[PDB]
RNA sequence: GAACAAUAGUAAGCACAAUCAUAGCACAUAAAAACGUUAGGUCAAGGUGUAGCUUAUGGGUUGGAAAGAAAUGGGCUACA
């Protein structure tokens, strides 16, 4: 059996997002891509750094936003600026949300020494594609 | 205190020009988008997932 | 405060944080003010050296090498040829013992 | 904290290999030349031999960045196959798809 | 919008060639529609072609420890679009390529080759040493 | 071949800025030696690892400063809490062996 | 717990099938392959539960290894 990135069949009650309900072999068929940047194209450089950056952005976004992160984090990279798109649950009040928005944008622009832009879209409950 | 305010599609004039609402490069916020759009591989129900909260 | 996304871009670009368009990959790097005949022709620093000796063979290959090199500015090339002068004159004994009189 | 002591010593090998680099290049310039005397070459030999062997290029080992795995490393992504596959399968790796032909 | 006219004789381009690289087809299709419609408005007179796709395939071992009869095969496809502009100016070039470049999608890269028209250099004109 | 060919080639050689006087194939390496960027200097080499001290310390700080949140470190912590509360801890240095 | 001139079975879920990829079809191959089985493999990818080491089971330098009496699996090159 192939165990790569999959969600096993339960008694049938297990809530599942469209993202985790599709096996790796579906990527580019049905599944899109989580990260978007130039680096893996035919003639191009520094894919590695965009990858390190990606990883740390996963870690950072999941540790900065405790319990409220809904679905896996969408990374866009355009004209040197990173557009970080996150689907996030409604947990905390708007004050802390904008606090952490500004906080994150500042710290990420300044660590990566490049302009960062953060887009949050709030969702009532985790999106369920299958089961339930 | 739980806050739910209706999306921009509710306040939008039918003929209001688009470049006003979408001047620059954007994430595609579903709320500000007047056009219904269904993506995602259908379940056997026959429903492509809505334009709302779609990852 | 921001009136538009264009205001965002505009301010980022004045600030020098946003990139410059249409992009030239050489934007922000002036290369010390140098020109090709300061790069290509290294005769200037070959002035002090024995002229007909094999030291000119070795230093002409070093020169022709530092000429073909985009990866280094004027300064470091010069430090190379200078370290070579300093080391060649550092040992006077070897050059003379080897069987060729070398200056 | 670098993930291992392995990655510690190899990082110090990258710093060092950057440091004595000029020395390397200039000494090995004469040492590899035919026209010059053999006598400048024996002395140049003792010279690059004198350098700390931690600063030489080939003592450096390519490892996966995060998981430190010495082998099975993909040069372009600096990532071990375990971690590569892990990342690409979640689709966290851009453009990488499963090959069918 | 501050505009200024310098007396100096603005650069001419015979052929401005723009390579648009991508993974996906759709984005490059749309972007093609974009560059075409943008270069029509400015009366730039352009063509577009599709350079044949290039596919790289490399293989990793499927398991953590040992099964060498079992392999995973991963793929990277690069698809092409090339815009060919003929007989344009330097300013028209800077503007059109500014507009085309600022909006360039995240997954796609762009390589531009400009062949620029120069009459002759000065020491060559008609002296002989 | 001719002397006209040798002189023509020397002309092209000294003109273009390439190697002028005839050399060994061996010595030519030194040409290519300064013609390139040496291996150990390349950014794709010395910059191989991102600084781990940086990310580690930065995120830990941000944690204790109450910005970032590490569930791994919380698992660890809580488990050493239930390890020492049990009485099997990490011995104060120097004490364990001889006593 | 099925019988179609049908006798107690209905069931969304997940496999297989269907579609995708192999630059048009069709085929083929590729992929896909649930549930469980073999306490199958790996604490040396990494991460951890339990136990241990903490002037050491830790961290560094330097030098040293991988020798064939055989026995055999797989290959390459042949015997023209
Ligand atoms: Mg199998
Ligand atoms: Mg090696
Ligand atoms: Mg087909
Ligand atoms: Mg078939
Ligand atoms: Mg198969
Ligand atoms: Mg199938
Ligand atoms: Mg099957
Ligand atoms: Mg066993
Ligand atoms: Mg372990
Ligand atoms: Mg442990
Ligand atoms: Mg030890
Ligand atoms: Mg040793
Ligand atoms: Mg036998
Ligand atoms: Mg054969
Ligand atoms: Mg054979």
From TrEMBL, chain A:
Its main location: mitochondrion. It comes from the Eukaryota. GO terms for cellular component: mitochondrion; ribonucleoprotein complex; ribosome. It is found in: Mitochondrion. The keyword Ribosomal protein applies. Keywords: Mitochondrion, Ribonucleoprotein, Ribosomal protein, Transit peptide. The keyword Iron-sulfur does not apply. Belongs to the universal ribosomal protein uS3 family. This is Mitochondrial ribosomal protein S24. It comes from Sus scrofa (Pig). The lineage of its organism: Eukaryota, Metazoa, Chordata, Craniata, Vertebrata. The gene is MRPS24.
UniProtKB/TrEMBL annotation, chain B:
It comes from the Eukaryota. This is 28S ribosomal protein S35, mitochondrial isoform 1. It comes from Sus scrofa. The chain holds residues 92 to 146 of 366 of the full protein.
UniProtKB/TrEMBL annotation, chain C:
It is found in: Mitochondrion. Belongs to the mitochondrion-specific ribosomal protein mS31 family. This is Small ribosomal subunit protein mS31. The gene is MRPS31. The chain holds residues 279 to 381 of 381 of the full protein.
TrEMBL record, chain F:
GO terms for cellular component: mitochondrion; ribonucleoprotein complex; ribosome. It comes from the Eukaryota. Residues 92-99 have a biased composition (Basic and acidic residues). Its main location: mitochondrion. The keyword Mitochondrion applies. The keyword Mitochondrion applies. Residues 83-99 are annotated as: Disordered. It is found in: Mitochondrion. Keywords: Mitochondrion, Ribonucleoprotein, Ribosomal protein. Transmembrane segments: none annotated. Belongs to the mitochondrion-specific ribosomal protein mS33 family. This is Small ribosomal subunit protein mS33. It comes from Sus scrofa.
């Amino acid at each position: 059996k192939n165990r790569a990135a999959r969600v096993r069949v339960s008694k049938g009650d297990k809530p599942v997002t469209y993202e985790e309900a599709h096996a790796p072999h579906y990527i580019a068929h049905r599944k899109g891509w989580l990260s978007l940047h130039t680096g893996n194209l035919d003639g191009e450089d520094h894919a590695a750094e965009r990858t390190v950056e990606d990883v740390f952005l996963r870690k950072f976004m999941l540790g900065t936003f405790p319990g409220c992160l809904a679905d896996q984090l969408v990374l866009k990279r355009r004209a040197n600026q990173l557009e970080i798109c996150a689907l996030v649950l409604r947990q905390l009040p708007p004050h802390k949300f904008y606090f952490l928005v500004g906080y994150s944008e500042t710290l990420l622009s300044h660590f990566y020494k490049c302009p960062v832009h953060l887009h949050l879209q709030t969702v009532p409950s985790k999106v369920v594609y299958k089961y339930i | 205190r739980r806050k739910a305010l209706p999306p921009r599609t509710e306040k939008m004039a039918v003929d209001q020009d688009w470049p006003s609402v979408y001047p620059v490069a954007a994430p595609f916020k579903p709320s500000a988008v007047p056009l219904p759009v269904r993506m995602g591989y259908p379940v056997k129900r026959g429903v492509p997932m809505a334009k709302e909260g779609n990852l | 405060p921001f009136q538009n996304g264009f205001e965002e871009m505009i301010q980022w670009t004045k600030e020098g944080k946003l990139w410059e368009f249409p992009i030239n990959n050489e934007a922000g790097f002036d290369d010390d003010g140098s020109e090709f005949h300061e790069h290509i022709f290294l005769d200037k620093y070959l002035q002090d050296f024995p002229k007909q000796g094999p030291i000119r063979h070795f230093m002409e290959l070093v020169t022709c090498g530092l000429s073909k090199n985009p990866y280094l500015s004027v300064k470091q090339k010069v430090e190379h040829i200078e370290w070579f002068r300093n080391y060649f004159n550092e040992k006077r004994v070897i050059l003379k013992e080897s069987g060729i009189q070398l200056n | 904290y670098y993930v291992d002591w392995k990655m510690l010593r190899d990082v110090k090998r990258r710093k060092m290999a950057y440091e004595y680099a000029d020395e390397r290049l200039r000494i090995n310039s004469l040492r590899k030349n035919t026209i010059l005397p053999k006598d400048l070459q024996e002395v140049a030999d003792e010279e690059i031999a004198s350098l700390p062997r931690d600063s030489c290029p080939v003592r450096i080992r390519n490892r996966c960045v995060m998981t430190s795995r010495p082998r099975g490393v993909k040069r372009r992504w600096r990532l071990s196959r375990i971690v590569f596959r892990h990342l690409a399968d979640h689709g966290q790796l851009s453009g990488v798809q499963r090959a069918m032909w | 919008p501050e505009i200024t006219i310098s007396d100096e004789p603005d650069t001419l381009y015979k052929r401005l060639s723009v390579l648009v690289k991508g993974h996906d087809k759709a984005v490059l299709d749309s972007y093609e529609y974009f560059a075409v419609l943008a270069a029509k408005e400015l009366g730039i007179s352009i063509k577009v072609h599709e350079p044949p796709r290039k596919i790289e395939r490399f293989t990793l071992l499927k398991s953590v420890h040992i099964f060498k009869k079992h392999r995973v095969q991963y793929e990277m496809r690069t698809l092409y679009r090339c815009l060919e502009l003929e007989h344009l100016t330097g300013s028209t070039a800077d503007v059109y390529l500014e507009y085309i470049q600022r909006n360039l999608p995240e997954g796609v890269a762009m390589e531009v080759t400009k062949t620029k028209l120069e009459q002759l250099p000065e020491h060559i004109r008609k002296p002989i040493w | 071949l001719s002397e006209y060919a040798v002189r023509m080639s020397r002309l092209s050689a000294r003109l273009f800025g390439e190697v002028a006087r005839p050399t060994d194939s061996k010595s030519m390496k030194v040409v290519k030696l300064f013609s390139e960027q040496p291996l150990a200097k390349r950014k794709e080499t010395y910059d191989w690892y991102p600084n781990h001290n940086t990310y580690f310390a930065l995120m830990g700080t941000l944690r204790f400063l109450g910005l970032y949140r590490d569930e791994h470190q919380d698992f660890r912590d809580e488990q050493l809490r239930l390890k020492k509360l049990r009485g099997k801890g990490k011995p104060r240095k120097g004490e364990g062996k001889r006593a």
